[PDB]
């Protein structure tokens, strides 16, 4: 009924994709009734630089919250490193890196 | 108890804008997204646009460069302008809590009473 | 865009039996999906989240089911405070949508 918000993104998760498909990269949420307001940023060096005016949306499988980035199609330069994150209470809520590879 | 209340209704020309105020009793406009949402006179639920937790907007297509949303949150007040008024933007218009901190409009738990605006000559 | 499509326009049941009303979405939304009732002069009231998850105080004659683009909200046995308008409402995303309301259903006791 109640819960601390976890973005679980596992340490070293990687993706490799064909430039030109479309991609869903998923951040995993954990929360209980208030849903976070989850964004997506990526690492420019020591800085995750926040994404905007991106495509994005939720999804729900076997009890189970992902918070969708979509890549419509993936381009060779969205290569990179991408993290999710999210205010609960006061706190900035950061995920482990997931990492993006793209066949050019 | 938690409560929104919503400024008095309004009439206006066409042309104009209009300005909406919700004040939120009871809640911070950090834990818990508003919605506006729309109702022209016996039609169907026009939801607008959601202001987040931050503060980030995101607007139905339609409504984009028409409206803007702001807040106070020293007051947990969120604002609703619509400009170059039409009379086809005649309609009740409401404000509504999202269950959710924002991006997305999650589902609405609690509504404001409503503002009417008519545009006409 | 996620279209929601509701049908039918108007339904009408007699009083005491079953009422049931659909709402489907053009791409899978999972179960983000909230029922609200409406009736005149006030504002619209939920009833139905996560697809099937009944709001606190609902009477449990209310129920929801489907996941994906197909939805159902069904009245068990409908009652006069029933009547009302009933819209679906879609919570996955709000990228270049119209409208995350479906344009409702009137519920109406046949006689």
């Known amino acids: 009924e109640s819960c601390d918000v976890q973005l679980y993104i596992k340490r070293q998760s990687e993706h490799s994709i064909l430039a030109g498909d479309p991609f869903e990269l998923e951040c995993p949420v954990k929360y209980c009734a208030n849903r976070p307001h989850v964004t997506w940023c990526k690492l420019n060096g020591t800085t995750c630089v926040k994404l905007e005016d991106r495509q994005t949306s939720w999804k729900e499988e076997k009890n189970i919250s992902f918070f969708i980035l979509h890549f419509e199609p993936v381009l060779p330069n969205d290569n990179g490193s991408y993290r999710c994150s999210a205010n609960f209470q006061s706190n900035l809520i950061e995920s482990h890196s997931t990492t993006l590879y793209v066949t050019d | 108890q938690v409560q929104l209340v919503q400024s008095g209704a309004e009439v206006k020309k066409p042309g104009a804008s209009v300005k909406v105020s919700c004040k939120a009793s009871?809640?911070?406009?950090?834990?818990?997204?508003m919605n506006w949402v729309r109702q022209a006179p016996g039609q169907g639920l026009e939801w607008m646009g959601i202001?987040?937790?931050?503060?980030?907007?995101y607007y139905a297509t339609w409504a984009k460069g028409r409206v803007t949303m702001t807040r106070d949150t020293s007051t947990s007040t969120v604002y609703m302008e619509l400009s170059s008024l039409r009379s086809e933007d005649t309609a009740v218009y409401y404000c509504?809590?999202?269950?959710?901190?924002?991006?997305?409009?999650?589902?609405?738990?609690?509504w404001g009473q409503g503002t009417l605006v008519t545009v006409s000559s | 865009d996620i279209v929601m499509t509701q049908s039918p326009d108007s339904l009408a049941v007699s009083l005491g039996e079953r009422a049931t009303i659909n709402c489907q979405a053009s791409?899978?939304?999972?179960?983000?999906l909230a029922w609200y009732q409406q009736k005149p002069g006030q504002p619209p009231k939920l009833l139905i989240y996560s697809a099937s998850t009944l709001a606190s105080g609902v009477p449990d004659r209310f129920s929801g089911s489907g996941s994906g683009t197909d939805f159902t909200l069904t009245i068990s046995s409908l009652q006069a405070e029933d009547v009302a308008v009933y819209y679906c409402?879609?919570?996955?995303?709000?990228?270049?949508?119209?409208?995350?309301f479906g344009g409702g259903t009137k519920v109406e006791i046949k006689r």
């Open positions: 409402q879609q919570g996955s995303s709000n990228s270049n949508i119209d409208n995350p």
């Open positions: 509504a809590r999202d269950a959710g901190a924002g991006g997305v409009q999650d589902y609405l738990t609690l």
């Open positions: 202001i987040s937790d931050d503060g980030t907007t």
């Open positions: 009871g809640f911070s406009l950090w834990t818990y997204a």
């Open positions: 791409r899978n939304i999972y179960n983000f």
